């Protein structure tokens, strides 16, 4: 005996990629000062490739009184290539922290989703 038609409704929505770091606590151990390369990796998982690729990366923080491009001696950040990454500017990323002569600092890694 035939039964009856049945309908299933539902919608799927994309979401922000989960963002974490290889080092726990979102803390980088720069070490005591006396320059010193401290590498740390940021991971973007738990999302689709299109969403992961269509992002915008920027850095924010307190600018040093002498050098606004150096996070408040100071801490500088370099990418894989080795180019200097200025702060306050418009799946695994490795960034190297260095000590620059001009101690706790805080930085804002900002990801904008298109």
């Amino acid at each position: 005996l035939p039964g009856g038609n049945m309908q299933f409704q539902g919608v799927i929505i994309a979401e922000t990629c989960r963002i974490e770091a290889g080092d726990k606590q979102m803390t980088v151990n720069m070490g005591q000062i006396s320059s010193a390369p401290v590498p740390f990796v940021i991971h973007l998982r738990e999302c689709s490739t299109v969403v992961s690729e269509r992002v915008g990366v920027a850095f924010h923080g307190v600018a040093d009184g002498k050098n606004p491009d150096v996070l408040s001696i100071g801490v500088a950040l370099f990418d894989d290539e080795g180019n200097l990454v200025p702060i306050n500017r418009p799946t695994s990323l490795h960034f190297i922290a260095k000590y620059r002569a001009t101690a706790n600092a805080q930085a804002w890694f900002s990801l904008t989703y298109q």
Binding site: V11, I12, I13, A14, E15, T16, C17, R18, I19, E20, A21, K24, Q25, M26, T27, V28, N29, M30, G31, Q32, I33, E46, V50, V51, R54, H60, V75, A97, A103, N104, A105, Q106, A107, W108, F109, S110, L111, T112, Y113, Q114
Partner: protein, 199 residues
């Protein structure tokens, strides 16, 4: 760890509040989540209220932030409005450099009565080719985002054309005549490839 439930938010006009899911899947970390609403140009505004503005969480846990509107129906009802929603994830700690994660997404204040369908708005975009620039003009009061902008055999940078307005992007002289583009729906999914019509 910290993750949002949607890449974009749609707020219908007259709605009392909207919910947004924020989740964390790590059992041994404490996170302080702070939120606020920015305008199109990136200026702090009180037109929207995030509740809670700042709250702490521990372990595997998910919460819902409520977005309230105090604009008092001041935004125009003939077109959509754009806002930047920011979510800051402060890691509660107990030489060290601390990192915070700021996720920025788009919130579209959409009026009640609209002339054009949101899905049909994608294919109504028009293009103009200058000597070295491409101008995208939108005859729809809907916000439109262009992705995978191929000019011949090469791609170009993304653009955010405003409703009832025009946007300009670069265009190499050696780029091909054909123009192809993609748009994003309200669900964050890329629309099927559509040819570029010239006017």
């Amino acid at each position: 760890g910290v993750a949002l439930g949607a890449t974009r938010v749609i707020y219908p006009a007259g709605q009392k509040q909207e919910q947004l899911a924020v989740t964390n899947n790590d059992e041994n970390s404490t996170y302080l989540i702070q939120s606020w609403v920015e305008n199109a140009d990136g200026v702090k505004d009180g037109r929207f209220i995030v509740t809670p503005p700042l709250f702490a969480m521990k372990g595997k846990k998910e919460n819902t932030l409520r977005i309230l509107d105090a604009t008092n129906n001041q935004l125009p009802q003939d077109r959509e409005s754009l806002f930047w929603m920011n979510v800051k994830a402060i890691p509660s700690m107990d030489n060290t450099l601390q990192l915070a994660i700021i996720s920025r997404i788009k919130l579209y204040y959409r009026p009640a009565k609209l002339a054009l369908p949101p899905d049909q708005a994608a294919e109504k975009l028009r293009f103009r080719r200058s000597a070295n620039s491409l101008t995208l003009i939108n005859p729809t009061p809907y916000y439109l985002t262009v992705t995978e902008l191929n000019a011949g055999t090469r791609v170009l940078e993304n653009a955010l054309v405003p409703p009832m307005g025009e946007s300009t992007v670069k265009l190499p002289s050696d780029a091909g005549s054909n123009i192809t583009y993609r748009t994003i729906n309200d669900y964050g999914a890329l629309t099927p490839k559509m040819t570029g019509v010239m006017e």
